[PDB]
Amino acid sequence: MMYVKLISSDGHEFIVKREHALTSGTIKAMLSNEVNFREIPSHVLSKVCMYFTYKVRYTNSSTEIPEFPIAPEIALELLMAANFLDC
Amino acid sequence: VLRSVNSREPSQVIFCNRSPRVVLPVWLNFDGEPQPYPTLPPGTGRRIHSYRGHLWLFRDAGTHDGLLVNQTELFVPSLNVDGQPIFANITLPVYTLKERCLQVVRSLVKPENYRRLDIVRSLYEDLEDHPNVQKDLERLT
Amino acid sequence: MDVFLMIRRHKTTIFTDAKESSTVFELKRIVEGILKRPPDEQRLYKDDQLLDDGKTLGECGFTSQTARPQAPATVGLAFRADDTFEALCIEPFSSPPELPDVMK
Ligand SMILES: CC(=O)N[C@@H](C)C(=S)N1C[C@H](O)C[C@H]1C(=S)NCc1ccc(-c2scnc2C)cc1
């Protein structure tokens, strides 16, 4: 399975499966193996990568789906990222 | 268009809330109007009397966020095989990250203060356009 | 049963999964493919505890109900340059801002 690199504004390099990252239409356009995010800090982009894993695990699944958690401290910045990424 | 059929053929049902939300059952009556029923706490269930061909959908009772029932939008009671009740498993959907983010922001900020938040004007309109049963009924049409 | 992990060294973070029944050594083989460094130049840690190559992830505390997709468990990583291993170093993420007045 091919992996891709997503880099935050503060320099954290996140490495995730290509398939997982293709959840975002925006990221698919930026690729079609590294992508730099000048506006997304590592504490937003780490949560974004967790959402990918969650989304692939529980999509088309009959087993009980749990709540995706979001702390109040990151909601605003994360809303703006999800809107840009379209996921 | 979306309305219960008047069959008068009884059907026992178990509403089972397998979500972390407080659930509001909604029966679509014979004129297509949504009727609200008493709420179900998280992890609880109730045995109820409905009829065959009657339409039901389910929401979060506080925020009207959409929930699924047996994997889908609507529930219609079917014929009871060997007098056994039909199970209606209410669950969370896999929300989009955007809609999940809007749920959390709506729960922290009061409606009046949405326009004071430092975001694009399209995100004010996404926040203010809060989930609604009558909108989704037009959407399923 | 699958467990979901963040493997972290310096400013690098790998998101991946594995079985509870799989070994520490087998996880190093996953790192070898991504980061291009063989198992014998790697050290894996649960907090400040070095992990043995032969032990299963379940024995080292990575269970399917604690290491979840929406909240994965962290595994420290440290490379060997030439002769000796480096000290374990995991750079923290950025701090969020203060809650705006309206969200309080
Ligand atoms: C002639 C006819 O069909 N009349 C309708 C108004 C009837 S009797 N209905 C509409 C739906 O098919 C359900 C049924 C009613 S009102 N059943 C009684 C009932 C009462 C409470 C509940 C609920 S829902 C959550 N908690 C409770 C106790 C469920 C069913």
Residue numbers in the entry:
A (entry chain B): 16 to 47, 58 to 112
B (entry chain C): 62 to 202
C (entry chain A): 1 to 104
Article, verbatim:
The modified Hyp residue is crucial also for the recognition of the hypoxia inducible factor 1 alpha subunit (HIF-1α), the natural substrate of VHL. The new structures revealed that the noncovalent interaction network between the compounds and VHL residues was fully conserved and consistent with those observed with previous inhibitors.
Boc deprotection of this intermediate followed by acylation led to the final thioamide derivative 4 (64%). Double substitution in ligand 4 resulted in the weakest binder of this series, with Kd > 10 μM. The presence of the thioamide on the left-hand side of Hyp resulted in Tyr112 bending slightly to accommodate the bulkier group. An increase in hydrogen bond distances was observed for compounds 2 and 4 (3.0 ± 0.1 and 2.95 ± 0.05 Å for O–H⋯SC groups, respectively) compared to 1 and 3 (2.52 ± 0.05 Å for O–H⋯OC groups, on both compounds). Conversely, full thioamide replacement in compound 1 to yield compound 4 led to an unexpected 2% decrease on the trans isomer as observed by NMR.
